[PDB]
Amino acid sequence: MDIDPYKEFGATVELLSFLPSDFFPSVRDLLDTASALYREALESPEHCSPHHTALRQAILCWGELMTLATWVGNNLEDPASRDLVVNYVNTNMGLKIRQLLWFHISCLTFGRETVLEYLVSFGVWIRTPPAYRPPNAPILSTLPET
Amino acid sequence: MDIDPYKEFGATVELLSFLPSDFFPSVRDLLDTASALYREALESPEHCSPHHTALRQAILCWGELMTLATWVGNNLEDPASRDLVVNYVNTNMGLKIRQLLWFHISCLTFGRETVLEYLVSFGVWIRTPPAYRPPNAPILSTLP
Amino acid sequence: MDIDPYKEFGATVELLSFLPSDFFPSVRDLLDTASALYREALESPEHCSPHHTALRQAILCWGELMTLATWVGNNLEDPASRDLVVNYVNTNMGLKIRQLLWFHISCLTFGRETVLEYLVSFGVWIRTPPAYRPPNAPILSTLPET
Amino acid sequence: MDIDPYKEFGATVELLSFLPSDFFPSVRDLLDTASALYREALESPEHCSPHHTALRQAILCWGELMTLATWVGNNLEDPASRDLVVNYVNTNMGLKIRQLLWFHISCLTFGRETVLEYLVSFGVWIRTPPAYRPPNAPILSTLP
Amino acid sequence: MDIDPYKEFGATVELLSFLPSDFFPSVRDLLDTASALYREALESPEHCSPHHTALRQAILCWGELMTLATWVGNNLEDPASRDLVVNYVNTNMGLKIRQLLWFHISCLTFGRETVLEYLVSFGVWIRTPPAYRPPNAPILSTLPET
Amino acid sequence: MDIDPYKEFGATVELLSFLPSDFFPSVRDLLDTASALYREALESPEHCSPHHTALRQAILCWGELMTLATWVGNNLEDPASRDLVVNYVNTNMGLKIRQLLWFHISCLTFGRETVLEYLVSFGVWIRTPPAYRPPNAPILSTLP
């Protein structure tokens, strides 16, 4: 139509595409982070922030894709096709699900503004020549003192 | 963690299960009604309501599954497997997307309280044995 | 002794008997309606209304009868007797459990008065000759407007 | 859904399990004590207390199981199966009815707080190894 | 170092040792008492009293020892050693875990002072010659009236 | 009942799982740091904080498991079984004791909020793919 999923958050899929693809943690790890942090936050009968709302749907999405991987693994004779599809679920669609979970999860943990600033800083920092950039890549601030 | 998608909206998947699987319109239809009613509402830089937000992730999801179907059509050569899998995307996984789309779309066109009393009243209309069922089922409408 | 279960609710077993037996939904369906509507309502450490209180006990009753169906199915050699009893659990005792769940469940969903009025209206409507009754049978009102 | 029957009354089935199975009086006895103490209270057109309400469903239930036993006696011809099943109604399913009846009947004769401190104090009396157990167990009474 | 577990509660391991070892209920029974009484009390994201705090850790301790009994039962060929260790877990370490659960559980149910007074009274009562002590041993008071 | 040990402290075992198993110092080290910092705090007739209380049960526990290891060394004669079991006490069961000790010890040296933002920030440092990870990991310190 189309509808950019981050547009309501002051971001774009092109803004998330600014970071290298070889950046977002595998979806099992993000899910692990969510369950560790916001399980009771999500399983509650109320939207807290739009970020939660987006996040639940994202997780249900990966849950449906996981169900798909199970059915495809269980119900196909050809191994070349079954392997190509089960691998496609995580390699291609998994990049989008990865950035999707990662964006809201970071947005809850730090803030929308902090993540936006981060996408910018890392997007620039990776693009700069090694000689003229700060020695270590930017990370997400939490408790930096004494 | 389980997290019921409707739980934030005062519902449960058990509440949606009251409706028969042969009830929700094909996803293409919900999408068309969505674009017809709430398109500018969705393509907005500001998030309007929680329903819009849930809805957008729903739509983007279905778009991703459609991309999966196109990719399955272009990549796989054998027709038995590609036909079994392209069908599993539409018939099986499509139900979950259908229920969500219908739930928010209807919540938007009428309201949450209307949709909920509706799920209950429809629950009564469906639970009734056929011999004693009213000639017409309840529907949502603004007149009525 | 005896104690009519609905008497505290301003009703009678004879009042529920006014409706045809071929009316109440099978118990799995009622349970489905309960779990869909009042799971969190029932699993809470407090009686909300007497209707809840009656309802929990009713459900525990059907749970005991279901346990009975399992033991009878698992622990008998004769198939004629095992089938006759397992069928008797739902056919005969199941009518009473059906009306029992249905009455409180409707009483919560609409109101005691609304259900009483309904038992009356349907009890009359089924008894009237087809020519002189409204074309469609009464149903339980919820949201009838525009 | 699981819903513990005593949960609304500030108890759990785990709390009742503190009492041994060889503790609750046969259901006929509870019924007799019930009719002796609270019969007019039960046959009342007005619901008195939540305990009465839970109690009535309990009694009506046991009456239904008794009807089941009579029907099993009249319908089945073979004695091995009818004797195994008529016994399963009294010995096995009867325990759950026994605990409920005893719990409310006792809650009525004394009170909830008395019944609860009782379940605890009895829990202590039973948990104790026999060598160190008091000559007499705790009981409920109004004097004492 | 050492740290007496009851010292913060106004007690000592020597104070618990005052009672005969053949007194504390087997750990499955104590756990049963805990789950019956304080399941919702313990599974809550807050320390209520230090007694709860001690108690959770005690239960996790017995849970680890139970896990140990499972691994030792499952992963050893020699039966004399496997039986000697699996029996040692409950016989020796189980006395300490028993008194540990029992002390806090009683401390919650009655009070710290009531349990201290009880350890004293029973410790004396068992030590007195039969002729000159009260006929029945002391028990933990709860609701003694009419 | 499950009861997560950290749940009372605003954490979960899932929150501690963010740290790799090859992260927590051997239990002897935590104990030594404990005696070095909070020994008089622990040997006190008054309970100071919930962390101290949880900590003492943790320490007494590990002491009991160490007694178990000594007893296994003195009782068992066969070396295959005694070596397999004495090792299972240190490597396997030791992890759970390690996490608890480290969690409270660190909560004491710095504070709960510091430890929690730490578990999160470390979660970010670890979740990152190696190619893009910062040259140094976050640590707790009072300067910094």
Author numbering:
A (entry chain C), C (entry chain C), E (entry chain C): 1 to 146
B (entry chain D), D (entry chain D), F (entry chain D): 1 to 144
Reported in the publication:
The virus consists of a host-derived lipid envelope containing surface proteins known as HBV surface antigen (HBs), a nucleocapsid containing a core protein known as HBV core antigen (HBc) and a partially double-stranded DNA genome. HBc consists of two distinct domains: an N-terminal assembly domain (residues 1-149) and a basic, C-terminal ARD (residues 150-183 or 150-185, depending on the strain). While the assembly domain forms the icosahedral shell, the ARD is involved in packaging viral pregenomic RNA (pgRNA). A dimer of HBc molecules is formed through a four-helix bundle which contains two long helices from each monomer. This HBc dimer acts as the building block for core assembly.
Here, by using single particle cryoEM, we determined the three-dimensional (3D) structure of HBV cores assembled from full-length HBc (i.e., full-length core) to 3.5Å resolution and built an ab initio atomic model, revealing differences from the crystal structure of the truncated core. Overall, the atomic models of the four HBc molecules derived from our cryoEM reconstruction are similar to their corresponding models determined by X-ray crystallography, with rmsd values of 0.737Å, 0.726Å, 0.667Å, and 0.677Å for the Cα atoms of molecules A, B, C, and D, respectively. Second, among the four conformers of the asymmetric unit, molecules B and C both have their C-terminal segments oriented differently in the cryoEM structures of the full-length core as compared to those solved by X-ray crystallography of the truncated core. However, our cryoEM structure shows no density that can be attributed to disulfide bond formation between the two interacting monomers in this region of these dimers, even if the cryoEM density map was displayed in a relatively low threshold, suggesting that Cys61 does not form intermolecular disulfide bonds in our freshly prepared sample used for cryoEM. The outer and inner layers are connected by densities around the 2-fold axes. These connecting densities are superimposable with, or in close proximity to, the newly resolved C-terminal residues of the assembly domain of molecules B, C and D in the cryoEM structure, indicating that the connecting densities are the linker region (residues 140-149) of the core assembly domain.
